[PDB]
Design a protein around this nucleic acid. Structure first.
Ligand SMILES: Nc1ccn([C@H]2C[C@H](O)[C@@H](COP(=O)(O)OP(=O)(O)OP(=O)(O)O)O2)c(=O)n1
Ligand SMILES: O=C(Nc1ccn(-c2ccccc2)n1)N[C@H]1CCOc2c(Cl)cccc21
Ligand SMILES: [Ca+2]
Lengths: 353, 945, 352
DNA sequence: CGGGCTCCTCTAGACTCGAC
DNA sequence: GTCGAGTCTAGAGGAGCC
């Protein structure tokens, strides 16, 4: 439970201890995620979007509404699969009716718990030719498991299970081995054409996708991950009290400080460096703006709990020669690099991670 | 009746076949010989035991030419090798005008007439040639330029990737990117490299062009063993050294010196085709072309000297015909090859990352021992370099906000210009310790990744990082004695860990090595599988997996961290060593025009798929035993459930309309040795105890020597192969004990020794075979008992007296096995040509033969293979003069009919890189293994149509 | 009207042609957004984040839920309430300093049918002395941000208004062709809401301002990223959607001109991977076989707000020249393939 | 006295070269 | 012109095949 203590201390979590019991987190009855929690979830969503949508020519975003209108009163959505199946026909025209193609979305879904638990879910509805459906399911299982293990300090804690639906449909379930047990973080289902035919009764010519040289009705493959429980999974995987989240996932990248004096010139130096790192896409924590000005060890521990990748220390000597000190969370070792080569290296360390 | 027996009551061949192989009139063994055999068998307690008769086989074999079997094989081989000996004779007599001074800078083929002129031609259009190919390794596997020697003129070839320069050339090779050629003979040094660059070689239909190699003939005539090559190179830079003057290593310069002599052969100092770029080749065209001409001329001069010596020491035509057929290997592939490469590389990278995550984590978590100088108290990392270096030196308004932004930018812009006081290249991680520093990739490194990304389980620091302990003692490395561990007695800290281990010299092992002089500790080497004289290079070997699972070897982190590391190492050990070979394989993809109509019209033909081939670069005689040599396909691992990329051979997939039909000989060298011993004792089959045991037993029934040994000592059958063939060729009792302990983990030191003497019990069972081998090996000119091929001049008794005895005695049987392979290839070619069986030779491993047969002719190919094995075994019997063949070894156990190359027709290659399997992923059904009776039923006992 | 047809056809919007109406787009009852519309909204949200939260330490992100539990919950109607709830516990981020703000982007549900709107909001806690000054500062910055991406920034307007209570507030508009519509609103709301939500013991609401503890004042800056997207589509509209380079969803159209198909597809795929690794969104038009006319392809990419159309042909294999075409100017130029990525990055930076 | 091959990674000693 | 950082072979132990 010390992980949640540190998380609420460092604004990953919110509320008191009553709302931060692991049952509340898993269920979705916790209050909103803290600011660093928002940043960590944004980083998870960005990595997910990169891997699934960005580098694939046939995965497209979809806008599914949060509410389900009509049959008298409407309801809040419980899964993103329905809206993607509703946009299947519309997005068939993008790929020029060529299968396989996908409709991806990250959104919030409302699960009854009679409380309501909100879960951020990343979905990929992957329309596939019926003959290669098992092959695509195994490929996506391997890809998703590799993606979850990519940012994991202990990839073995991410596992898969081969499951069968009550109707006998094949599918796979991913898991993360939390300290208490083994919780579900993702699920893949080879649904088939049942949902497409039910949602689009009548003629099936509209549903046909050109697989090779033959028209065919796609078998819907539904991938659905939990980014809230995924965020919790990576917080547990990360957790000297140090998180050690991934460089591509850590919410705050650089912590910036000052030295002895003169204050005014060092303030200008830090302001320029802050603006530079901001313009270069690197989020920075402005520790030079703090007034308490605690010791170096206290700052080091504070930044360790926040998964701070680097601590830049602009001293008086940065004026003389342009050298700035840098402590690495990975090894707690100090190094000196010139002020001209900080931005390029930080971009390098992150990209190559 | 068709059932027959010998004087020793062993079922011989069926009467119908015996009347066609040996005819009638063979000399009877005689009463004295039979009495001696019966006395021997009764003495060994092996007489009076009946065996169930195998069903008789009635075959109408093809008409065998000549008066007996030897004349039949001679006639076949002479018909096969007649035109190619004519081409070799053309290359052996004609004289060539000197190389022209000015080569042609043209695309295609150029023919140099008299006075050095250059004439454009389409092909060399010659029966015999000497060929050499130059390839720029920077541009890939496409050929660059080539010089060919004809008995009349000089020939030169240049690629359009040399005459012309373009922004991008296709990475996928095609026949149009290769060297055009095509009853022709092409000679070269390592011709298989030059064969791989010929345009017409990759066609699925066969071609009549054959290739002769100078390394192969050198190994046939004056070849050297690997130990011999080491000793020769050490000398060029045992009590017998007369073999040095009549032998050389396979390098062209060394061979030219050995045979032709004269001025030394010189190589290009710069090595442009390996290290340089295409611009260098265009700049230095004349020099490189002249060097190619020099090499081809040297090869021609060497061939002139080698051919008569080879035809003298290896007079049987079957040897040359088989060496010609053994050099036309062929492996078909498809788009699944590219998918396999991608999937295997991806799996290797994923497991590499998985292991390096744990590695990097611990290292990054060990740097805290630097703080406070605590590494002196660490039992593992005390000896490493902890020294650190030093960094060496030579609200607001819109206008107000804009001005403040510009000023804060200019403040650093002034600071960004003070780089003049810094070195051009920055120091690499000056702050971190030396050990950490060495493990991080430098920033300039093209492939850079953050953290200690240069750490591996093979590094000498990794076991100390992972804190591996053997019986609770930390592992310590001694440069003189390899790996090991420290038994206490940071010596204070080592004992503290051991004391904690006990809660959770008094230790016997490889003895306390006093040379290490580690204070307050003893050094014991890790028990190596090959004895106390060997040194351990890494505790992450396969042999240490059982000890890690048992708990004698442990990891500091504990849990599954250690065992998972060893498991991943076992998974990726093969790919780590073979991915450069496998990935770089010269694949040439055939367009739809060049494919046969059967492949195109077949139901399994895929319009969007690729069809290609890989020509193995086989050295036909790369061994003193005259075996074939190939870096990749003769070392290609079998599919295992744990090995990444071990489905390599399963990717050799027949095209649509084609299947791979082949078989593997059963206890080949066992039978060859037993039949030699029999012919030495008395002219019957089963005279000796070893020959009787070999004949008594079937592989299906699980009673053959390998299976019997596997049952008796508990090891697997392949382990039994290692054990038996080691014992035959010289392994002592300690070798047997170590192999048993290695392959059977439950045995103790005493139990392994007893089970060794049980297999080493036997005036003995193995006496006559040993006597025959030692008599032939010590002969003045040792020769193969069947085809009469002489040993290399470097291993004759005059050259080496009482030296390399094991090599020569094993050479007898192993070169006899090569004779078996030559006979099989000759007979298979004869049967394929006579009965018009559509197909061709695919690839031969040292006792396996594969044939790319069309689908409609798989069972005809199976019957042809059975007939070939029958005739080869009868030939082996006939040369030794036994005049009979047992029915037990008359045919193959099974002939594999599969669409991919795998050891068993039923096994599915489910490896880490291929988890679904060949059936689910690539759609490759299981094959069928058929014995003689099933093939007879399926093809009516005939090879005709 | 024709712009809405283009947006539906080019996958900016979603649904049937008769299903999309002006009122349904302004209210939140439209079926949703097409992939290009979703990416344009993400671009707008990233620009809003850059211009509000990224370049200010004082501004932090928050996470307010969609439903408010307790007194049988209901869907949230604005992003202000969650920010005010988070005001008390967020003082430890700034060590009880003042001023500081909380900003967020999320869907707000409005009774109409249920209307969902993507509203970008910023609440600003300030001492009451400088409340009007901070309000004017935020008004300036927001109007500058709205007019930054505009082809015709005269259409974006600002106005001054008074509420029923009588507090100072500004309303930011966009002059749609049918008339001005509210795309943003600023209000100086005072401390009534914070006291009502936290009655009694106002010592917990004190903020430090020069060692002086103050119960702050809240400024509400409520924009409409959906109406912002509509405003930019209307302003950006030969049928060409001249969207700003920082907002246009897809930048490059990559195609194949000749044969062989394997080599050209290989070089196009390498270029595609390079541009993607360099952060440039590419429409993979080289996958399509039997392509239409080049003029029709140009018209299609103009309607999709594609910055540049790159065509790779047989000549590319010989030297490396690629046909490059610009959206703004109908001018064709040939550039070496290795210089395309740097040119695109330079163009995006220049138009920023 | 196993034999016959194949290649790899890692480490150490020697050489080259360039920048200060 | 000195000395420390890149390049290069040589050797050793591990690991595929028959
Ligand atoms: N460790 C080994 C392996 C093989 N061989 C030689 C002897 C064999 O005759 C030949 C072929 O090897 P196999 O493994 O095929 O041995 P067998 O042919 O006896 O086995 P099988 O009956 O399974 O074919 O190679 C050897 O000397 N030592
Ligand atoms: O992961 C890496 N890779 C590499 C490889 C070479 N590098 C380098 C970087 C700058 C100057 C010299 C050398 N860096 N370096 C981390 C690990 C240790 O901690 C740090 C710190 Cl304190 C600062 C910066 C980087 C790192
Ligand atoms: Ca065999």
């Amino acid at each position: 439970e010390a992980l949640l203590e540190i998380c609420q201390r460092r604004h990953f979590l919110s509320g008191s201890k009553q709302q931060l019991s692991r049952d509340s987190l898993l269920s979705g009855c916790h209050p909103g995620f803290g600011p660093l929690g928002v940043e960590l979830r944004k980083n998870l969503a960005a990595e997910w979007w990169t891997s699934v949508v960005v580098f694939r020519e046939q995965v497209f975003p979809v806008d599914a509404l949060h509410h389900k209108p009509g049959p008298t009163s409407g309801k809040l959505r419980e899964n993103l699969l329905h809206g993607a199946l509703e946009h299947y026909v519309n997005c068939l025209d993008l790929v020029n009716k060529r299968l396989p193609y996908g409709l991806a979305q990250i959104g919030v879904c409302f699960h009854p718990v009679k409380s309501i638990g909100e879960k951020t879910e990343a979905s990929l509805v992957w329309f596939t030719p019926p003959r290669t459906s098992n092959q695509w399911l195994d490929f996506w299982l391997r890809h998703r498991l590799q993606w979850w293990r990519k940012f994991a300090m202990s990839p073995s804690n991410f596992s898969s299970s081969d499951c069968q639906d009550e109707e006998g449909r094949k599918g796979n379930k991913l898991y993360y081995n939390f300290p208490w047990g083994k919780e579900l973080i993702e699920t893949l289902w080879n649904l088939g054409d049942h949902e497409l035919l039910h949602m689009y009764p009548g003629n099936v010519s509209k549903l046909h996708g050109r697989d090779g040289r033959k028209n065919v009705v796609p078998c819907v493959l539904s991938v659905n991950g939990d980014l809230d429980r995924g965020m919790l999974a990576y917080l547990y995987d990360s957790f000297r009290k140090v998180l050690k989240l991934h460089p591509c996932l850590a919410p705050i990248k650089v912590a910036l400080d000052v030295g002895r004096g003169p204050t005014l010139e060092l303030r200008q130096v830090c302001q320029g460096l802050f603006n530079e790192l901001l313009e270069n896409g690197i989020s920075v924590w402005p520790g030079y703006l703090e007034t308490m000005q605690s010791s170096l060890e206290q700052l080091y521990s504070k930044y360790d709990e926040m998964s701070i990748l680097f601590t830049v220390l602009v001293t008086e000597t940065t004026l003389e020669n342009g050298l700035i000190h840098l402590r690495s969370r990975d090894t707690t070792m100090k190094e000196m690099m010139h002020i001209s080569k900080l931005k390029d290296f930080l971009i390098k360390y992150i990209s190559s991670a | 009746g068709q059932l027959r027996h010998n004087p020793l009551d062993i079922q011989m061949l069926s009467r119908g076949l015996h009347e066609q192989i040996f005819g009638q009139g063979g000399e009877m063994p005689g009463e004295a010989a039979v009495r001696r055999s019966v006395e021997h068998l009764q003495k060994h307690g092996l007489w009076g035991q009946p065996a169930v008769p195998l069903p008789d086989v009635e075959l109408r074999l093809p008409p065998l030419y000549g008066d007996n079997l030897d004349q039949h094989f001679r006639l076949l081989a002479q018909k096969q090798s007649l035109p190619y000996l004519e081409a070799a004779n053309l290359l052996l007599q004609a004289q060539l005008p000197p190389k022209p001074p000015a080569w042609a800078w043209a695309e295609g083929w150029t023919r140099y007439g008299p006075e050095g002129e250059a004439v454009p031609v389409a092909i060399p259009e010659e029966r015999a040639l000497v060929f050499d190919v130059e390839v720029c390794l920077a541009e890939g596997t496409c050929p660059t330029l080539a010089v060919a020697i004809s008995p009349s003129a000089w020939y030169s070839w240049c690629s359009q990737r040399l005459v012309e320069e373009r922004y991008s050339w296709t990475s996928q090779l095609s026949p149009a990117d290769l060297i055009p050629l095509e009853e022709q003979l092409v000679v070269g040094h390592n011709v298989s490299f030059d064969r791989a660059h010929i345009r017409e070689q990759y066609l699925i239909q066969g071609s009549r062009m054959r290739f002769l190699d100078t390394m192969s003939m050198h190994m046939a005539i004056s070849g050297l063993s690997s130990f011999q090559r080491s000793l020769w190179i050490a000398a060029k830079q045992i009590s017998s050294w007369d073999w040095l003057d009549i032998s050389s290593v396979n390098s062209l310069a060394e061979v030219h010196r050995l045979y032709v002599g004269g001025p030394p052969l010189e190589k290009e100092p710069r090595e442009l085709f390996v290290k340089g770029t295409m611009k260098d080749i265009r700049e230095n065209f004349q020099d490189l072309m002249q060097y190619c001409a020099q090499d081809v001329w040297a090869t021609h001069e060497v061939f002139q000297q080698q051919l008569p010596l080879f035809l003298e020491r290896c007079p049987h035509p079957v040897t040359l015909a088989g060496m010609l057929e053994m050099g036309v290997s062929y492996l078909p592939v498809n788009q699944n090859w590219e998918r396999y490469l991608a999937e295997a590389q991806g799996t290797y990278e994923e497991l590499q990352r998985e292991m390096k995550k744990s590695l990097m984590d611990l290292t990054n978590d060990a740097c805290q021992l630097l703080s406070g100088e605590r590494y002196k108290e660490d039992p593992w990392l005390w000896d490493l370099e902890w020294d650190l270096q030093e960094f060496k030196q030579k609200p607001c308004s819109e206008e107000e906000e804009f001005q403040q932004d510009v000023m804060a930018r200019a403040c650093l812009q002034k600071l960004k210009g003070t780089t003049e006081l810094l070195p051009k290249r920055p120091q690499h991680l000056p702050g971190h310790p030396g050990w950490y520093r060495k493990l991080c990739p430098r920033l300039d490194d093209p492939a850079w990744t953050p953290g200690p990304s240069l750490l591996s389980l093979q590094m000498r620091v990794t076991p100390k990082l992972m804190a591996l302990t053997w019986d609770g003692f930390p592992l310590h490395y001694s440069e003189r004695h390899g790996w090991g561990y420290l038994v206490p007695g940071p010596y204070r800290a080592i004992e503290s860990l051991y004391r904690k281990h006990c809660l959770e010299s008094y230790h016997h092992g490889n003895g306390p090595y006093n040379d290490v002089d580690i204070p307050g500790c003893w050094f014991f080497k890790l028990p190596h599988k090959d004895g106390n004289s060997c040194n351990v290079g890494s505790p992450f070997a396969k042999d240490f997996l059982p000890k890690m699972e048992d708990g004698t070897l442990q990891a500091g982190p504990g849990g599954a961290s250690g065992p998972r590391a060893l498991e991943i190492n076992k998974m990726i050990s093969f790919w780590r060593n073979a991915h450069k070979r496998i990935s770089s394989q010269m694949v040439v993809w055939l367009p739809r025009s060049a494919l046969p109509r059967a492949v195109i019209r077949h139901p399994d033909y895929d319009e969007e798929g690729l069809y290609g081939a890989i020509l193995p670069q086989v050295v036909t005689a790369g061994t003193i035993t005259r075996r074939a040599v190939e870096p990749t396909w003769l070392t290609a691992s079998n599919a295992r459930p744990d090995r990444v990329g071990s489905e390599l051979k399963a990717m050799v997939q027949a095209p649509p309309g084609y299947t791979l039909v082949g078989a593997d000989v059963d206890s080949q060298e066992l039978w060859i040795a037993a039949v030699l011993g029999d012919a030495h004792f008395a002219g019957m089959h089963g005279c000796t105890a070893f020959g009787w045991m070999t004949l008594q037993g079937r592989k299906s029934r699980g009673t053959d020597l390998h299976s019997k040994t596997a049952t008796t000592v508990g090891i697997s059958r392949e382990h039994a192969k290692i054990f038996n063939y080691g014992r035959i060729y010289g392994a002592g009792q300690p070798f047997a004990e170590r192999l048993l302990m290695q392959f059977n983990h439950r045995l103790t030191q005493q139990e392994a020794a007893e089970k060794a003497q049980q297999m080493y019990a036997a005036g003995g069972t193995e006496s006559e075979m040993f006597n025959k081998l030692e008599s032939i090996a010590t002969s003045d000119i040792p020769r193969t008992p069947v085809l009469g091929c002489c040993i290399s001049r470097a291993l004759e008794p005059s050259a080496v007296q009482e030296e390399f005895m094991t090599s020569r005695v094993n050479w007898v049987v192993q070169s006899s096995a090569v004779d078996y392979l030559h006979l099989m290839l000759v007979a298979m070619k004869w049967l394929f040509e006579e009965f018009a069986i559509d197909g061709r030779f695919c690839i031969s491993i040292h006792d396996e033969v594969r044939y790319l047969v069309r689908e409609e002719d798989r069972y005809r190919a199976a019957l042809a293979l059975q007939i070939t094995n029958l005739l080869t075994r009868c030939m082996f019997a006939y040369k030794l003069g036994l005049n009979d063949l047992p029915q037990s070894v008359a045919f193959f156990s099974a002939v594999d009919i599969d669409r991919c190359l795998r050891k068993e027709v039923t096994m599915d290659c489910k490896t880490p890189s291929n988890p679904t399997g060949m059936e689910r992923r690539y759609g490759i059904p299981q094959g069928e293994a058929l014995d003689i009776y099933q093939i007879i039923e399926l093809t009516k006992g005939s090879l005709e149509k």
